[PDB]
Design a protein around this ligand. Sequence first.
Ligand SMILES: Nc1ncnc2c1ncn2[C@@H]1O[C@H](COP(=O)(O)OP(=O)(O)CP(=O)(O)O)[C@@H](O)[C@H]1O
Ligand SMILES: [Ca+2]
Ligand SMILES: [Ca+2]
Ligand SMILES: [Ca+2]
Ligand SMILES: [K+]
Length: 994
Amino acid sequence: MEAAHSKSTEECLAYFGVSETTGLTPDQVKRHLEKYGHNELPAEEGKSLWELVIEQFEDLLVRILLLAACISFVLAWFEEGEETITAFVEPFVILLILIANAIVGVWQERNAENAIEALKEYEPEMGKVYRADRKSVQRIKARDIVPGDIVEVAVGDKVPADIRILSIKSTTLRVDQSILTGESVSVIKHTEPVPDPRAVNQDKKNMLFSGTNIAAGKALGIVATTGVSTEIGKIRDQMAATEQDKTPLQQKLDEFGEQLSKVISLICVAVWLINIGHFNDPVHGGSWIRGAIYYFKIAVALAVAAIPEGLPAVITTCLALGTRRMAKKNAIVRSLPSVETLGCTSVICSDKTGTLTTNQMSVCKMFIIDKVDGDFCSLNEFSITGSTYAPEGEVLKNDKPIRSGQFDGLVELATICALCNDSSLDFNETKGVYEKVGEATETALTTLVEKMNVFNTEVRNLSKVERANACNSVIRQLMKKEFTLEFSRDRKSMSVYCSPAKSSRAAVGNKMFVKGAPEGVIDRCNYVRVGTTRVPMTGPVKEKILSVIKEWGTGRDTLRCLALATRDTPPKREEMVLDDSSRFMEYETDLTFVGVVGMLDPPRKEVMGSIQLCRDAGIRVIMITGDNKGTAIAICRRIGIFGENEEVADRAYTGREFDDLPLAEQREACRRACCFARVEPSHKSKIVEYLQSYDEITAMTGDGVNDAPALKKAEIGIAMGSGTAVAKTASEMVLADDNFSTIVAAVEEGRAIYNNMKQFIRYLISSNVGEVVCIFLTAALGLPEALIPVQLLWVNLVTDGLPATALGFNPPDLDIMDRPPRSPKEPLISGWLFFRYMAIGGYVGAATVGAAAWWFMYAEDGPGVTYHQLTHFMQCTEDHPHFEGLDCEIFEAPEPMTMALSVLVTIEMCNALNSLSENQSLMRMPPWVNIWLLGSICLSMSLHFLILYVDPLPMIFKLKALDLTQWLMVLKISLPVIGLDEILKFIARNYLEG
Ligand SMILES: Nc1ncnc2c1ncn2[C@@H]1O[C@H](COP(=O)(O)OP(=O)(O)CP(=O)(O)O)[C@@H](O)[C@H]1O
Ligand SMILES: [Ca+2]
Ligand SMILES: [Ca+2]
Ligand SMILES: [Ca+2]
Ligand SMILES: [K+]
């Protein structure tokens, strides 16, 4: 623990007793661990309490059913309701369905949190340190960092601990501290003390805070605090729920449920008025109150029955489920809406290097000049074996291994690769593999240098740890690096200013060593080095060099290329201003060309496939990269973005060609082109923005800081697990896998969630419309009543709970990934689907009324009132308007009513079987494609049998039905509802639209 941004850099080193360049000793690390513990927060636990989660009773349609239960609990406390205990049952036929859905949602939520926590904890965060046991920097688990050690951070990195800055290697250091300070744009740092002890974080301009991101630059620091003492460590618990709101589709279904309240309300108030007449009837003594209280109970029960009380939970669930499924594919969802949004994406923009490609670079080819004689220019080309970062391989010329030191050009070439380089190698002792520290492109040069061994340095007798940077160090010992002009994407090159080492010859000349995109670099060369010699750049020499670059980048290896140059006579340091990055290009002029290196960088295995799937799902894939256009077009071909011969003259563009276009033309180019190359970070963002101007849902995939703006602009930003912390911070999803296949899976999951939300609604609407159609069909046709308040509450508990919820576990449709993407502003409910809600709701309305009627008429066990119903119910007591007074009251027989109640349950459970797929037949999508549904159905049917046959219960709900023959008819009236939808599905299937 050091308490000061306010002590000097010397004082900090001395406090911890550390040598700035070596780092802590093994024993020091031992002590510091003991005294300071591991660099991690304890928390890591809790989050949502079991009870906290349970409270999604907080919704809308749930509060309605909630209150409804209150009243049925209060109407019951007044000793009445119609039948004593039957009124205390009511409040529980209501809560039960709420409790069921609550349990499911809670369970889904728990499993989700878990799966995610599993995936997040999987891959250990690493840091870079200099420690006394190793000359070059090394990577260690971030939790093993202690106060006192020398840490290295560079553009892209998450700052691993609270660090006091020692040394800024770049000309500036910019940092993203939003997570801590709310400071929206990156901020500049220095290494000078900040006197004020009580200084607020924003003024700690010589400190790097754990959890912030290096936006730009490279720095060396010493760790002040770790773990909980960390600036962001103190503030973990605090903060009043920075957790946001809900998803578009969620607010949509929500809004939709909002207006269903209105309608159901009205239909209910209606039911009350429609029946304000039967208020005096003998059934409730005709009391001038007992009649309206009953029908008010009928309306309320009809309401609780009509309201899709489960809709809120099923969204929550399908969501928690998609997150869980994605977690299983090693995708981390940082933002809930991302799966649904991905669901209707029409365009996937994608970075090339490290995203479409593995970013495992190896220098496999190189050249320098050989002869220059007038229009004749010849190169010395070489090949290099070893594909990994291991310093193991050969330099081949003409199939014979050569001693690089033999060629003065290679000596210089390796010198440049070694000095103009912000990366290094670190040998992982446990994995037994050489790993990069820093950027792949640079590390590839490091391993190259080790392979070239141009000064014939003795390395055979070195450990694998030492062997990793041995020849590079040799070069470093030979030239002092005064300073570095950081790589920048406008100039697309990078520089180092160096002086001869021992200062023994303090004027044999200073040099700058330059490396960069070949086109820019070759343009700024005026000389060409030939061995130890120098001759002027000419057309022929340049054409030669460029064409071999073209050859390599377009050939079967699709080589990523770089030019290497030296500035033989650099400006005086004093004439050089380090303040403005924009003057670096001029400093990097009048160059001598030395050579080119060509890098191998294999495409990911799963990409070509994923793209085909996008193509099938109507999804466009665009490659966007800073790399040369040649290599980018070639790669696109290799992975299927472009055909192997496809003309691409106006389907591929460099940033410059794209800028040369009018705005209108740029927008258009984005609609046809699929390869954008040598484009800056601003270009990436613009392209995405253009796609969005066609009101399209755009995804962006990337890994590097040049991608963060586009990543933030897209609808869904997807970062690679292997990429920069900056790219991850700007994303909604992270592929911890680095597996590009997952993107397509996410799309499909998001497509499936929508479809499940759909069938759920279709089931509730078409069914509940039916129930309401019943109450109005009998009351209008002038029949005995079909149902009673509690009977209503029961078809509710049994047809609107788990059978509905279960549809959320529907399997994806057969063609789900073979249609195009749904426009996001598609009316939630199609014009045709509404007719389908009615055709079904109608059969349900008229099948449940026909059942009670059939009992009164065609039913043997029942009376034989025979067609016309004898017409009315004017009889009542003993023989009234005498039209065959053979039976007294019959109506008020539980039988006709229990009958309808059982066609209702049965026929609802029947057309939930229609809700496995929008338009697919039960033929291609059989009932057993969703087992969860079949279980729920059995649960309800069986629950319905209980109520009917367990002796005390039928009294509470109204007496039973002859197993043998009654059911035969219920089942005979109900089964057709499957036949009816199956005609409807066929209609919209055999004729297709949507
Ligand atoms: N460290 C470095 N020093 C010098 N030149 C570099 C460099 N890193 C990259 N370059 C060159 O600059 C060019 C532009 O880099 P930029 O980062 O925009 O793209 P990229 O091609 O490296 C990444 P991607 O394919 O994801 O877009 C690279 O293609 C390469 O030629
Ligand atoms: Ca309901
Ligand atoms: Ca990249
Ligand atoms: Ca229902
Ligand atoms: K975004």
